[PDB]
Write an enzyme that holds these catalytic residues in place. Structure first.
Site, PDB file in Angstrom:
ATOM      1  N   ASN A   1     -44.099 -89.434 -22.279  1.00  7.58           N
ATOM      2  CA  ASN A   1     -45.370 -89.885 -21.761  1.00  7.58           C
ATOM      3  C   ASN A   1     -46.427 -89.852 -22.861  1.00  7.58           C
ATOM      4  OD1 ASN A   1     -47.904 -90.073 -20.429  1.00  7.58           O
ATOM      5  ND2 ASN A   1     -47.740 -87.959 -19.702  1.00  7.58           N
TER       6      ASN A   1
ATOM      7  N   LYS B   1     -53.899 -90.503 -23.655  1.00  8.41           N
ATOM      8  CA  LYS B   1     -53.926 -90.803 -22.232  1.00  8.41           C
ATOM      9  C   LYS B   1     -55.353 -91.177 -21.917  1.00  8.41           C
ATOM     10  CE  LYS B   1     -50.844 -91.161 -20.451  1.00  8.41           C
ATOM     11  NZ  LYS B   1     -49.762 -92.182 -20.776  1.00  8.41           N
TER      12      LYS B   1
ATOM     13  N   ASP C   1     -50.405 -85.475 -12.698  1.00 14.40           N
ATOM     14  CA  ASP C   1     -50.016 -85.978 -11.364  1.00 14.40           C
ATOM     15  C   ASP C   1     -49.401 -87.403 -11.423  1.00 14.40           C
ATOM     16  OD1 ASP C   1     -53.094 -87.186  -9.642  1.00 14.40           O
ATOM     17  OD2 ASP C   1     -52.230 -87.676 -11.640  1.00 14.40           O
TER      18      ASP C   1
END
Lengths: 264, 262, 262, 264
Positions: free
Chosen positions: D25, D59, D234
């Protein structure tokens, strides 16, 4: 759960896939025999279990005057001749409680039309008729709610239920097939066989390939020699000449994925 | 805008004061039906709102064969006959089988086609042929421009007194959303049939009811219960009926005297 | 709920008379901007409706790099300064890049976060930091209860003057549907931020949608208009403005003096 | 139809063996990145699957401004240079701001347009002008026939090496559904761009991946982590890393089979 339909034809999510294949509606004996015979010939050659599909009534056309098929009485005569001529099991849909028992004398599987899947009295009449039941999942119903219909069937003594995907409502008019639904239908109903209608779900090949790769008990298919000339605003049938080409890809994928496990 | 005469003093139409089709989910007892219907009658009479009492005599689509279905056809018709005799109110109910339409039409003032059954030719034709005005529920799977075909089936057998009822469209799994553009679509593609909005089945009931009434429609469809938390989709609490209806009437009277844009 | 002071005599709030955020798609020329705004100003003054002039200075998300993008930042701000000087009306514009926020906030009275950028942390923070009220456009992919996180980012950097703007939700491919239940969810999960309804982007039926949204009870309407929208989504025909607005005021004034149910 | 050369021995194309665009990620540290990339390299090598390592350096859209954003541009590119040096693998990352495109392109082998930013003209032009192949993420709000506008923007500034990445479509609130018919529509309406399927974001990972790969596509896009349950996100859950080989062996078997089957 494996559902025994007739000798040599058993549906189950871990078994070789079963083709539930045929035509939209019964118009005549001869046309039915010719189309069914071509299905039989192709599935025999390839080694795919086969159940012939047709409706005896189109119960929901746009006009009360639109052609509805040969109807119940003549339709069951045609189905009897198909069974005698080819030794093939048959599946048809049941629109009214009162049709269930007469249909069950001849048909080997009775189908609950999608729009009628919540109608308690119809579902009970179909389940009590004593044959395996195919429940069409309506486009409005999520995959985890089909269990209630399966329960109504089990409550009147019929545990031989199969579940048939045909797409979910996606905005207005359009349908989308959620490939995560197959497992959710299987797992929430005790392992009922799951079948994929690649006709009403509308690139048939893209969709059929996708669905078979997931690992399912069956394929549901309508075909016609010349689909573009249908007297129908219904969804297009597969052109009949493409049947063998389609099914050979389905068998290849199906045989491959049915020997591969889940991830641990 | 075609208007549909339900009874003397109740006529539904998209340019007319809205009509309340109100009542309860299913008929269970004479006693409770009379209790609830009587409150609706008193509130509507007080506010000056045309009223048609609504209830099902059978819940044909419950999740279990042993789930309670209501009093059924024969007792249902007797209860409706009492409701009519005591209050002089017209009644609407839904018909699930072709053979029910004729006997229902002897007592009921409007016959309703259940949403899931709207495309079934034989049921729709039996309802239409029974000779009362017909309320077609729009299935959540059906776009607003397709309802014309059901209406045409009714017209095909001699029944031109058709009304259309909105109850939401499928929005992902399980959820319904109400497209407020749909009311005019339904009306304009069907030759101006009265359009009715079910704010109960569509589900903040006040938000939705305000929105739908403001568009300019023929009717509201409503279920109420004295204590909907502890009853076994959620009806309006019966004690809020007057407060809800007074806003509906206020908005409806305002919008029905405003035109389209130039 | 919470009220957002935009300029002297223009305050937006869900319990207050609605504010029109009205204007045009994009700034093209001084002449045309002044022509349209002048019309909005005269109609809103006549009817007594608080008014904020709306326009983009850049269309940052058009389909070809040769598609016309508007006059751009430097010139757009000059036009906005003229608009303000001449009419004394406050203005709202959208901001696509972090470094534009400070310059824009010297002239604009409300900064808007474009729908597709609502989750981009750095853009939202630069906009919130610039010190004017913020209008957050709810993207078609976002559920009403998730907009709170964008409002909290604004709050995390000291900006508590945030409004939220409905423009529809994805409904199958391409189409949008407005869920009228979303207004209250947006307001209640964000501490009562003013909610604004874009009737234009949400889409002949502008009136149906506008009536429905204004009836729920909201802080504002967002409207784009054009003198000849057909020969120019689709803006309101400018000559219809007074007709549309007189109905909005009538409904808003009615509903803003009605309670919640008991 | 179109083949996009990524690096020596790595070429993506809808008729070619699928390419795994696989990784993590976000870039957190050098050593964790090397360890995870090293595991992907070992498995893809063993199995014989072409590989591009994926990771984000930022992110750009967490819920809170205080939430962890990864190492950032400068340190992220240093980590990427080391990955290339150590493993000889090509790498792909996403670009959030116009000004990052040129410096990212000095190290990265493919530049990705974030889904939410796919319509932003200035960002797409800066990425396209940077001179490396481009992966456009299809946002959940965009229909498959509209992606052609983004590809044309890239072409208008001289970059014809564009791939298109499926991540699902909005289905009611919050949920995503993957329309398996979109793959062909994306490919056919854009001149044959390689189509890639993100089985992570799109959410049963195996059901979906099997379905997508069976349709016949250029690539899979995958994030993994040794302990996905304990993610400090999340966001959608990564594949457990230990399942990588089992997943990829099934992908290879299906892809190899369907890539040698014709059209009907």
């Amino acid at each position: 759960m494996n559902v025994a339909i007739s000798p040599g034809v058993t549906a189950g999510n871990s078994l070789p896939f079963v083709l539930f294949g045929g035509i939209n509606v019964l118009e005549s004996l001869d046309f039915t025999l010719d189309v069914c015979g071509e299905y039989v010939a192709v599935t025999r050659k390839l080694g795919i279990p086969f159940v012939f599909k047709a409706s005896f009534d189109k119960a929901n056309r746009s006009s009360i005057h639109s052609y509805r098929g040969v109807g119940l009485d003549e339709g069951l005569k045609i189905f009897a001749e198909v069974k005698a001529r080819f030794g093939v099991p048959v599946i048809t849909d049941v629109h009214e409680a009162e049709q269930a028992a007469p249909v069950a004398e001849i048909a080997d599987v009775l189908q609950v039309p999608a729009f009628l899947a919540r109608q308690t009295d119809l579902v009970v009449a179909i389940a009590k008729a004593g044959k395996p039941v195919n429940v069409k999942k309506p486009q409005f119903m999520s995959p985890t709610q089909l269990k209630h219909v399966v329960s109504k069937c089990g409550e009147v003594g019929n545990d031989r239920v199969m579940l048939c995907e045909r797409g979910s409502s996606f905005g207005y008019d359009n349908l989308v097939v959620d490939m995560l639904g197959f497992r959710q239908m299987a797992e929430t109903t005790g392992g009922c066989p799951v079948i994929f209608d690649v006709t009403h779900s509308l690139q048939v090949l893209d969709l059929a390939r996708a669905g078979i790769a997931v690992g399912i008990a069956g394929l549901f298919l309508e075909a016609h020699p010349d689909p573009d000339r249908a007297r129908c605003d219904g969804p297009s049938a597969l052109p009949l000449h493409q049947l063998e080409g389609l099914l050979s890809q389905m068998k290849a994928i199906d045989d491959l994925v049915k020997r591969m496990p889940a991830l641990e």
